[PDB]
Write a protein that binds this ligand. Sequence first.
Ligand code: BCL
Ligand code: BCL
Ligand code: BCL
Ligand SMILES: CC[C@H]1c2cc3[nH]c4c(c3C)C(=O)[C@H](C(=O)OC)c4c3nc(cc4[nH]c(cc(n2)[C@@H]1C)c(C(C)=O)c4C)[C@@H](C)[C@@H]3CCC(=O)OC/C=C(\C)CCC[C@@H](C)CCC[C@@H](C)CCCC(C)C
Ligand SMILES: CC[C@H]1c2cc3[nH]c4c(c3C)C(=O)[C@H](C(=O)OC)c4c3nc(cc4[nH]c(cc(n2)[C@@H]1C)c(C(C)=O)c4C)[C@@H](C)[C@@H]3CCC(=O)OC/C=C(\C)CCC[C@H](C)CCC[C@H](C)CCCC(C)C
Ligand SMILES: COC(C)(C)C(=O)C/C=C(\C)CC/C=C(\C)CC/C=C(\C)CCCC/C(C)=C/CC[C@H](C)CC/C=C(\C)CCC=C(C)C
Ligand SMILES: CCCCCCCCCCCC[N+](C)(C)[O-]
Ligand SMILES: CCCCCCCCCCCC[N+](C)(C)[O-]
Ligand SMILES: [Fe+3]
Lengths: 302, 281, 240
Amino acid sequence: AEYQNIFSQVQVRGPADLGMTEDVNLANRSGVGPFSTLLGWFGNAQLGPIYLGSLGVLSLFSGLMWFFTIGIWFWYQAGWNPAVFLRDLFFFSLEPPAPEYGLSFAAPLKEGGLWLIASFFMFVAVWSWWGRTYLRAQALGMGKHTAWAFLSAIWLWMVLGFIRPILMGSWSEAVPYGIFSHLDWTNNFSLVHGNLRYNPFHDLSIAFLYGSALLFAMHGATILAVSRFGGERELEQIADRGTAAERAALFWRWTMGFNATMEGIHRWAIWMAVLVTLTGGIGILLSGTVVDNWYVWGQNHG
Amino acid sequence: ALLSFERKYRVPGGTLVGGNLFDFWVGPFYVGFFGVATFFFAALGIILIAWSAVLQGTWNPQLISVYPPALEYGLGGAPLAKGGLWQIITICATGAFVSWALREVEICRKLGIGYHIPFAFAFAILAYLTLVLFRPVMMGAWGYAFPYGIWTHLDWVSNTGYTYGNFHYNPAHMIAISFFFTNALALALHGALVLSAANPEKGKEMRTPDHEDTFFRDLVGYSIGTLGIHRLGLLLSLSAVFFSALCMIITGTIWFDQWVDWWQWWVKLPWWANIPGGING
Amino acid sequence: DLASLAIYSFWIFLAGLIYYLQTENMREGYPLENEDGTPAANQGPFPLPKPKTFILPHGRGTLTVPGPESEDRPIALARTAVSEGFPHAPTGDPMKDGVGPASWVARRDLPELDGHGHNKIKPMKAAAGFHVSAGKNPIGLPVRGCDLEIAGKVVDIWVDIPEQMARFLEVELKDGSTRLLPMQMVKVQSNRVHVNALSSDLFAGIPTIKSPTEVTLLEEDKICGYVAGGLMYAAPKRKS
Ligand code: BCL
Ligand code: BCL
Ligand code: BCL
Ligand SMILES: CC[C@H]1c2cc3[nH]c4c(c3C)C(=O)[C@H](C(=O)OC)c4c3nc(cc4[nH]c(cc(n2)[C@@H]1C)c(C(C)=O)c4C)[C@@H](C)[C@@H]3CCC(=O)OC/C=C(\C)CCC[C@@H](C)CCC[C@@H](C)CCCC(C)C
Ligand SMILES: CC[C@H]1c2cc3[nH]c4c(c3C)C(=O)[C@H](C(=O)OC)c4c3nc(cc4[nH]c(cc(n2)[C@@H]1C)c(C(C)=O)c4C)[C@@H](C)[C@@H]3CCC(=O)OC/C=C(\C)CCC[C@H](C)CCC[C@H](C)CCCC(C)C
Ligand SMILES: COC(C)(C)C(=O)C/C=C(\C)CC/C=C(\C)CC/C=C(\C)CCCC/C(C)=C/CC[C@H](C)CC/C=C(\C)CCC=C(C)C
Ligand SMILES: CCCCCCCCCCCC[N+](C)(C)[O-]
Ligand SMILES: CCCCCCCCCCCC[N+](C)(C)[O-]
Ligand SMILES: [Fe+3]
């Protein structure tokens, strides 16, 4: 009956934590949200403050404009009937301009127009948010790591609804906005480029996706295993190595003949996750622009 | 050789089997009884796989493939050359993996740390066992198990999903992908948050966890916190593999039709089933 | 063609990255050593990285790694064999000597600080604001070691202020002195706090701290070292 440190046995609360000031404009921070005892057993109980500057307002407003634009469309597919809308929620789909309209913005509102409107709002939403990622780090004097990793996720999305479609000569190639429709798009794309397992960037992206689960499991499990020596206070074990960091490393050395450090594991961790969408995005972009059938390609290699 | 701080941890004890008999290392490697056990099962398996290679025709690692007993043998034995090797190797694989986990428990006992790693490794082992043992037994034959080859196990992934349609419609599979994708998200965020605090802008001083808590709060209005994100990565990962096993133990067993049709339960609900309009009206 | 170029180029980048990453994980514990502490012949195929320097924050200096690496203390172990690769048996008491699973590292003998420059861990008794918000409050409960004997009474909770978590329970012994015990090695029960790692007679041996309103990183390490180590060295006086 030894404690495991997956859930906290006792919670503790104190004055709301308002954060660090520095070069952060404190006029754009909200106050503190409430405290959740539910969250508290697993993580931190405090919600907020949040920093809602103008780039964030811009971002949040387009984000919602995109979602609402899809949502409006869904109601029109449902003939404004609540029971229908819930019933078929996963079946609705806001599809892009058919092939004949190319990269044009002419296709009518109900047959492509709305799709484009939605995408526009998503475009500025994501790119505004990325900017924020950078700007919030910058105001704290921290490295730009969160933004460079985000870019990688962005790479996949950009290729999927913007770059590939443009290189292919039409917005018809882009992904539709819907739950089942995007799954069908996915299956569909695969049956047309012949054997998705012979796309080498697709395989590698899979190796990194599973590898990210293996690495977060290893990592997470390792920090809990040495949380009885202060293990999760990583920055200080980076700055002044302790027995947490030591027995962590030596578990792995004795298990598989090599190990990491408290700092280096996070380098391994950020590359494992980033590579997923880095290699995936290359895999997709090349599909149908350069290579029409990964099986054929894999027979010649050109 | 030893890392510079290791010698103090290389003391006797913690083994589960044999006492002092295998309490030693070979280079960096710890060896318990179970280090001996993993070597035995793993070198048998490697040998039997090599043996399977010769009967097959090639030495090409990309062609070597070892198939399970054709469906015809059900859950009985089979001649080595027709799924017998797969049955022995699978036992060895099981042995090698379980032994690796228990060896891990031995390294944990020596080092004074929680057992969380070997336990997590056991979710992978259970996913492995579900494809090669739990599904097939429930299904009445070894033959529904995947083959062992770099590219034929991939063929088997497709063949087994397209037997149910777009396998995307498996709903346990959807939850599983959600956790894989959410795990990757989180691992990029964690790697990047700690790094960015430890490597600040040039010339500046190392940031602190508070700075870490502030950065996430500023960006999304909430930070899970350093204990919490290691808890979160563990949970997300293990839940991915758990939903993976679950999405597959229920496939070909309680559900064997096309997973896209499973969703008709929802649309065929009395209150809106016959209402006109929508996609299904 | 373009796809085979991308793939050719990608394998080269991945090999460079593994190399970069592996050498980056050589900034501690290297160079490798023989069991007597001298530099090993075979260091492996990855060269040590050019050094880097962390600027520590509340006037505490810098850290440059790699750098000349010294255990900053005596290790009470001797060999049990005439050749490489076997276990080193403790020469005295492994719990007191701080070896094996009872090890500790000579961390700075200053306490950790938050971003405001205030000690990060303080006892709740002096943490303005801070109270127990959910779960059984342990303060006041009897403390039982693995021998099934009472060793003490919980008299306070040491808390991480910035991160708002329970880090240690402050326990009081028969003589009136206190010991800090790691939260993660205790079990908070309805009518008791149970410590599986230590026997009732090993509570007095837990490394004490110099001040009652703060704990240094060196003391945490001696504390956590000592209670984890009981899992192995307290086995005889353990039961169930
Ligand atoms: C799990 C879901 C499906 C499946 C779906 C896929 C898909 C889809 C893909 C793979 C791919 C791979 N799979 Mg698979 N695979 C399954 C079950 C397995 C099992 C198993 C014992 O259960 C193993 C060992 C593998 C192994 C592998 C690798 C050959 C390859 C890259 C994996 C990776 O990065 O993981 C992440 C882990 C790490 C980074 C740690 C490194 C692990 C190493 C690299 C594995 C080497 C194994 C070796 C070749 C096996 C022979 C061992 C000898 C007998 C000694 N698969 C089940 C049947 N697999 C990818 C591929 O590239 O094939 C060409 C791919 O796209
Ligand atoms: C039947 C389908 C085909 C197939 C077709 C495809 C196709 C097509 C693609 C993949 C891709 C991927 N596939 Mg495949 N794949 C198949 C079989 C597999 C198998 C398997 C076991 O058999 C596995 C394990 C995988 C695994 C994977 C992933 C590694 C990879 C996606 C990574 C990712 O994180 O994207 C998820 C991450 C993103 C989509 C980026 C998100 C970024 C943006 C910026 C976020 C916007 C958020 C927005 C503003 C909304 C906010 C909402 C919030 C509430 C606020 N595939 C089968 C054979 N696969 C992708 C790829 O890279 O392939 C090379 C892809 O395009
Ligand atoms: C066309 C094919 C179908 C499809 C059919 C299937 C099938 C069929 C299966 C999956 C399974 C999975 N699919 Mg699907 N899937 C499709 C599309 C997708 C897409 C996508 C983008 O479209 C994604 C993201 C996924 C995602 C996933 C995962 C949920 C899951 C696999 C991970 C796993 O189980 O690891 C679990 C971990 C393991 C199996 C590995 C454990 C290894 C062991 C413990 C140790 C190995 C050691 C080794 C010998 C190395 C030693 C040597 C060296 C020392 C390293 N699928 C399409 C629609 N999918 C698989 C799954 O759910 O399995 C339960 C499954 O069987
Ligand atoms: C939540 C579960 C995630 C996870 C976690 C995880 N994996 C782990 C651990 C943990 C916590 C370990 O402690 C352990 C580890 O030590 O990593 C270094 C491990 C591990 N995960 C591994 C692989 C692995 N894990 C994977 C997945 C995952 N691991 C999950 C996503 C995957 C995939 C495909 O996603 C792979 C490929 C090993 C690197 C390692 C365990 C090493 C080991 O057991 O050595 C023992 C045995 C041998 C040296 C080889 C014996 C093999 C022979 C008997 C015959 C060959 C068998 C046959 C099945 C071949 C299959 C061929 C394929 C082409 C299909
Ligand atoms: C390395 C690749 C992995 C990765 C990394 C990654 N993602 C990232 C980052 C990084 C490093 C960020 O910094 C950034 C981040 O901020 O996260 C906190 C992000 C992020 N990844 C996101 C999603 C995401 N990432 C994903 C994937 C991945 N991200 C990869 C696994 C996926 C998928 C499909 O797997 C998704 C869906 C976002 C949380 C965030 C980017 C936020 C953003 O750009 O949005 C703009 C602002 C808005 C759109 C507001 C919109 C509001 C909602 C659309 C409506 C609300 C929906 C809700 C259901 C209710 C709605 C309320 C209304 C009814 C009132
Ligand atoms: C309850 O009803 C109300 C009204 C309250 C609602 O709000 C309901 C709302 C809904 C039910 C909302 C549902 C929203 C979804 C179902 C969305 C589904 C989303 C996915 C499955 C999306 C998947 C993939 C998306 C991709 C790849 C997007 C790519 C975007 C682009 C890169 C954008 C590129 C730019 C374009 C095309 C514009 C070009 C023009 C310029 C000037 C730049
Ligand atoms: C300027 C004072 C007004 C702000 C007070 C309102 C509290 C909101 C805090 C947001 C926290 C919630 N969040 C970000 C998780 O969504
Ligand atoms: C997919 C990741 C592959 C990891 C390969 C890295 C090899 C580990 C190098 C360790 C050898 C060095 N050592 C122990 C002498 O320092
Ligand atoms: Fe970490």
